[PDB]
């Protein structure tokens, strides 16, 4: 329960799927929703509209916590990543920060081969 | 697949008719499903020439081959049609 007020809304933004989860300031999660679980499967999982439906399905089931302000973390080069945040300020939230936290290696491990 | 064998100055025998259909059974399954075939055999004082008009789900394709003794002409005709059938097949796959 705990009725927390300010939270963090992480957005995983892979190419094939967009995952949006909502946590608090401390970092432990509250609820999540994906674009593959919103009824979109296959070619339509990589659509910015499917990231919007994943957002409003995650904007519900956190009414139990009562969030009115949250930060936004985006991670990945996805087709969503900005249509998700438009489905949150329209859902009645105060977006204090929007932050890019995508992982960039300062040249570390070897990626796979280019597919032909 | 329906064969229609026809000869201009080459009256087709029974051994030649089954030689066409056994050869046209090859370029069958192995390359594409087809609707209807018209085969035309011609002899023009030197050239045993064999034509063929295939009808497929997309359009039509035609090939001709002149040869040596009317058996190598159809053997060159199928290799001309089989390459046009693989080019047409991958034109309709585009994966």
């Amino acid at each position: 329960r705990k009725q927390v007020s300010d939270g963090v809304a992480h957005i995983h933004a892979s190419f094939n799927n967009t995952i949006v989860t909502i946590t608090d300031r401390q970092g432990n999660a509250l609820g999540w929703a994906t674009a593959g679980g919103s009824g979109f499967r296959g070619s339509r999982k990589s659509t910015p509209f499917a990231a919007q439906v994943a957002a409003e399905r995650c904007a519900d089931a956190v009414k139990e916590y009562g969030i009115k302000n949250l930060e936004v973390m985006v991670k990945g080069p996805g087709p969503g990543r900005e249509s998700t945040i438009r489905a949150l300020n329209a859902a009645g939230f105060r977006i204090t920060n929007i932050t890019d936290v995508t992982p960039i290696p300062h040249n570390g491990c070897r990626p796979p081969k280019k597919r032909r | 697949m329906q064969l229609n064998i026809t000869g201009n100055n080459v009256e087709i025998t029974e051994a030649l008719r089954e030689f066409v259909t056994a050869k046209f059974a090859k370029l069958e399954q192995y390359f594409d499903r087809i609707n209807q075939v018209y085969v035309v055999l011609k002899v023009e004082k030197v050239t045993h020439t064999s034509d063929a008009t295939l009808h497929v789900d997309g359009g039509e394709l035609h090939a001709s081959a002149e040869g040596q003794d009317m058996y190598a002409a159809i053997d060159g005709l199928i290799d001309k049609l089989a390459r046009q059938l693989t080019k047409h097949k991958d034109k309709l796959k585009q994966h």
Binding site: P77, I85, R86, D100 | -
Partner: protein, 65 residues
């Protein structure tokens, strides 16, 4: 990268900062070490960059219109 701007919400002011160097980098770490093609592509790049310098300087003679 980090926008904590006030007033009216419109990332608009976010994609100015973020579409700067946050997607060209992740799409090129996406796959293949290359180890020698960077070289090829790099060297093809500037042979076409001076193709824009040494032609557009020579294109200011006339325009036939």
């Amino acid at each position: 990268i980090k926008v904590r701007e006030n007033e009216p919400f419109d990332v608009a002011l976010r994609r100015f900062k973020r579409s700067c160097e946050k997607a060209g980098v992740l799409a090129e770490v996406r796959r293949r070490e290359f180890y020698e093609k960077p070289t090829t592509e790099r060297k093809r790049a500037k042979a076409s960059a001076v193709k824009r310098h040494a032609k557009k300087l020579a294109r200011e003679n006339a325009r036939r219109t």
